[PDB]
Amino acid sequence: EGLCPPGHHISEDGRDCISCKYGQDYSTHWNDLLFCLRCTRCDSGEVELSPCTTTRNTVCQCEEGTFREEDSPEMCRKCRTGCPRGMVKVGDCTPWSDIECVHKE
Amino acid sequence: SPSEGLCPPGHHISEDGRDCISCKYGQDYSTHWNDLLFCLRCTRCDSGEVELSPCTTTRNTVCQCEEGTFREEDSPEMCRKCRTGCPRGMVKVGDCTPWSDIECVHKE
Amino acid sequence: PFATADIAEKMWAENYETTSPAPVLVAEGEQVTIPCTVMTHSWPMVSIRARFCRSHDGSDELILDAVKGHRLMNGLQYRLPYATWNFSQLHLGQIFSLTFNVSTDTAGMYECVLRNYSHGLIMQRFVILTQLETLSTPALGRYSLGDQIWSPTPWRLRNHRNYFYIGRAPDEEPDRCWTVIQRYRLP
Amino acid sequence: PFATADIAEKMWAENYETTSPAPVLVAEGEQVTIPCTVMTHSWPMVSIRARFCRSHDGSDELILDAVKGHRLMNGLQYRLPYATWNFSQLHLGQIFSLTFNVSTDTAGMYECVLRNYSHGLIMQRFVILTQLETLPALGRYSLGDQIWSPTPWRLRNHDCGFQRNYFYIGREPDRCWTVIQRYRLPGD
Ligand SMILES: *[C@@H]1O[C@H](CO)[C@@H](O[C@@H]2O[C@H](CO)[C@@H](O)[C@H](O)[C@H]2NC(C)=O)[C@H](O)[C@H]1NC(C)=O
Ligand SMILES: *[C@@H]1O[C@H](CO)[C@@H](O[C@@H]2O[C@H](CO)[C@@H](O)[C@H](O)[C@H]2NC(C)=O)[C@H](O)[C@H]1NC(C)=O
Ligand SMILES: *[C@@H]1O[C@H](CO)[C@@H](O)[C@H](O)[C@H]1NC(C)=O
Ligand SMILES: [Ca+2]
Ligand SMILES: [Ca+2]
Ligand SMILES: [Ca+2]
Ligand SMILES: [Ca+2]
Ligand code: NA
C-alpha cells in the first residue's frame, strides 16, 4: 500500500514517483508523500556512523563516555563515572545506557 | 416498573432492573428519566452561599453567592469577594452581583 | 422555576489547567464534537458536563456507564435535543464524546468528568464560543499551545463596542462564560 | 543492516510532560489503542511515532494527512503488520489512533505528533509495557508518576524468563529504560 517505493515521493499530479535528493531527504517505505523526509543532521556529542541515503536516515550515535536519553529532548548525556558509597554499580556506560546504581538500604 | 427501561425523575433503578425506587428527599435526586443505581447527592450550600431553594427528589439545591461576592466559573467554582471599585483613571464597566465581579477598563 | 442539577462534590485533576485548551470561536451551525479521553480508572460513571454561556444555572450532564458506555441519564436533552454521543473501549482507556451543532444557546464550558453519585473529578474543559465582544481585528489563528483564543476557521473572522464572530461558510443577558474567558487573551 | 527513520527536528509541546501519563503494564495479546486528540492546527500531516523497547533504533511513524486522514506512509508495517488506524474530523480538532495487539516486540514509547517534512511537534507520549524487572499495590490510572495497569488484579511475580523479580500481567537491552525509571512503582 502506497504508490511510490522507498527513495521516492509522489508528484503533484499523483501520477509520478520522483526520487528523493541524496544527502537531503529520504523515505523508508512505500508511500504517498508529496515530499521526502529531511535527513537527520548529527549534533555535537554525536558521531555519524552512516550517512543518509534516499532510502534510510543518517545513523547518529552518542560519543564514547556519553549515552542516549530517550526522554525529552532525546539528546546525549554524560555517563556517571561511578556510584555513591553504599551503592553497587550494575549497568555500565554504553551509547544507549548510563551505569545503574542500586542502594542496599 | 421502568417505562422504556427507564425510571422517572425523582427515582433511580434497582440492581435487577425490576423496580423504580424513590430518591430520599433532602439527600439526593434525579432530574431526568434514568438507569441510575443511585440518585445524585444534593449540593449543600457552603458558607458564603445562600440557599435560595431546597433540594427535592427532582431538582438540586439552588445556592447563591452572598451579596458582595460573585460566582467564579473557573476552578474551583466557589464564591469570591468582589474586588474593590475601579482605580482613578479607569472606568467601571461591570458591577458586583452574585454572578459578576466588578469590571474595569483603562482609557488606554 | 426550572429544575437544575450539578456535581455535589467537585474536584479537579492535577493537570486540569494544562490539558484544557484556550476557548475556541466557532461559527453557528457548525457541527463540533467534544472529545474526552480517560485512562482506565475505577469510577463507575463518566460524564460530559455542560454549563451554557446563556440563560443557565448549575450544570447538565450526559452520564454514561464507565465500563460499557451506556447512557444512564441524559441531563443535556432539553438544551441539546439533537445531540449524539459515542463511547470507545481502548482497553488502556476509554474515549467518549458529544456531537452537536453550535448555536448561541449551546456556546458553553464543556467538561470531561469521572463520576460517582456525589463526586466528580473534572479532567478537562473545552470552551466553545460563538461571539466575542470588545471595547475602544486581532490576528486570530488556528490552535497553538497557550492562553490565546483561536478558531478552526479563522479566515472567516468578521467584525459587526465591537463584536467578533465567525461567518458561516447583539444582546444584554449575562454571559456565564465571562469569568473563564477573561483568563485568556486575544492575539 | 536495517534501514532506520526518525524526525529530523524534534520539538515538544509545553505540556508534553503533564499530559503524558505514567507507563502502563498490559498483558501480552491484549488489544490496545493509542488515542491522539489534536486541536485544529496548521501542520500538513500528523503521525503516531513508535520507539520499541527492543531491537529498535530510530523511530517509526504512521504519517497521515492532517486534513483528510489518509495514510501517507506506514512506517510501522513491519513491526506491527496487523495494526489498524482511525481518523475523525471533529471540526474543532481531530482524533487519530492506532490499534494493535500488545506483545514483547510491540512494547514501546508511542507519541502523537504534528508533522511536516523536517519537523515534528511531539504532543503526548504513551509508554506501553509487558514486563517490569526488579532487584506492590498496582492500581488503575490515577494522576501522577505511578506505573499502572488496566487489569491490576492479574499482576504476577516470576523470577526470570541479584535479589530479582519479573512483573507482568498475563492471560538484550531495553530502550524504554531511561523513560521507565523516571516513574515509580506503588509502595504499598
Ligand atoms: C465517590 O468518589 C469520592 C472521591 O473518590 C469518594 O470519596 C473518597 O472516599 C475515599 C474512600 O472512601 C476516601 O479516601 C476519601 O476521603 C474520599 N475522597 C474525597 C475527595 O472526599 C467516595 O467514596 C465515592 N463514593 C462511593 C459511594 O464510592
Ligand atoms: C516545518 O515546521 C517548522 C517548525 O514549525 C518550520 O520552521 C519554522 O518556520 C517558521 C515560519 O517560516 C519560522 O518562523 C520559524 O523560525 C521556524 N521554527 C522552527 C522551530 O524552526 C518549517 O518552516 C516547516 N517546513 C515547511 C516546509 O513549512
Ligand atoms: C446540524 O447541522 C449539520 C451541518 O453542520 C447538518 O448535517 C444537520 O442537518 C444538522 N443536524 C441536526 C440533527 O440538527
Ligand atoms: Ca432531595
Ligand atoms: Ca448535586
Ligand atoms: Ca491488561
Ligand atoms: Ca516514540
Ligand atoms: Na486501517
Author numbering:
A (entry chain C): 78 to 182
B (entry chain D): 75 to 182
C (entry chain A): 32 to 167, 175 to 198, 208 to 216, 227 to 244
D (entry chain B): 32 to 166, 176 to 201, 206 to 215, 230 to 246
Q: Which lines from the publication concern this structure?
A:
The complex of HCMV UL141 (residues 30–279) bound to human TRAIL-R2 (residues 58–184, both numberings start from the initial methionine) was crystallized and the structure determined by single anomalous dispersion (SAD), using experimental phases derived from selenomethionine labeled protein expressed in Sf9 insect cells. The crystal structure was refined to a resolution of 2.1 Å with an R factor of 22.3% and an Rfree of 27.4%. One UL141 dimer binds two TRAIL-R2 monomers through non-crystallographic two-fold symmetry resulting in a heterotetrameric complex. Structural analysis revealed that UL141 interacts in a head-to-tail fashion to form a well-packed dimer that is stabilized primarily through polar interactions, such as hydrogen bonds and salt bridges, and several hydrophobic contacts, while burying a total surface area of 1423 Å2. The UL141 ectodomain exhibits an N-terminal immunoglobulin (Ig)-like domain, followed by an additional C-terminal β-sheet domain. In contrast to TRAIL binding to TRAIL-R2, which leads to head-to-head (180°) trimerization of the receptor, UL141 binds both TRAIL-R2 monomers diagonally across the entire UL141 ectodomain, resulting in an approximate rotation of both TRAIL-R2 monomers of 90° to each other. The high affinity interaction between UL141 and TRAIL-R2 correlates well with the large solvent-accessible surface area of the heterotetrameric complex in which 2694 Å2 are buried on the UL141 dimer (1347 Å2 per monomer) and 1351 Å2 are buried on each TRAIL-R2 monomer. CRD-1–3 span a length of 70 Å, and CRD-2 and CRD-3 form the major ligand-binding region in the UL141–TRAIL-R2 complex. The combined structural and mutational data suggest that contact patch 4 is specific and crucial for TRAIL ligand binding and that viral UL141 mimics this structural motif to specifically engage this TRAIL DR. In summary, patch 5 involves strong hydrophobic features important for the stability of complexes throughout the TNF/TNFR superfamily, and we postulate that UL141 has evolved to mimic this interaction in order to modulate this TRAIL DR.
